[PDB]
């Protein structure tokens, strides 16, 4: 059979593509997190930035071009 993996970091575009592929015919969200001090040096009150990159994936099982999405068949 055939498999389509689709991966993307912006939920809106991913949903648009996922919607308009159903016009032609477990994978949960995992979050890349980095916490880093806000200052370039280490002087002052110790405050921290919390940065987060959330990705999304869908797996279509089978028998529109958007810049930012990733698709692999395997």
CB atoms within 10 A of CB 8: 21
Query: What's the CA gap between 15 and 21, in Å, rounded?
Result: 10
Q: For 67, which DSSP code? A: B
Q: Toward RNA, which CB reaches closer, 40 or 67?
A: 40
Q: Toward RNA, which CB reaches closer, 29 or 73?
A: 29
> Is 47 near RNA (CB under 7 A)?
yes
Contacts of 73 (CB under 8 A, 6+ apart): 2, 3, 4, 5
Q: Out of 2, 23, 24, 31, name the contact with RNA by CB under 7 A.
A: 31
Residues that bind RNA (rule: CB under 7 A) add up to a total of 25
Q: Out of 1, 2, 23, 42, name the contact with RNA by CB under 7 A.
A: 42
């Amino acid at each position: 059979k055939y498999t389509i993996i689709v991966v993307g970091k912006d939920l809106k575009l991913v949903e648009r593509y996922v919607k308009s592929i159903v016009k032609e015919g477990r994978a949960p969200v995992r979050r890349l997190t980095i916490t880093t001090r806000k200052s370039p040096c280490g002087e002052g009150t110790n405050t921290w930035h919390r940065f987060e990159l959330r990705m999304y994936k869908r797996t279509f099982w089978v028998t529109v071009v958007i810049p930012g999405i990733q698709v692999t068949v395997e």
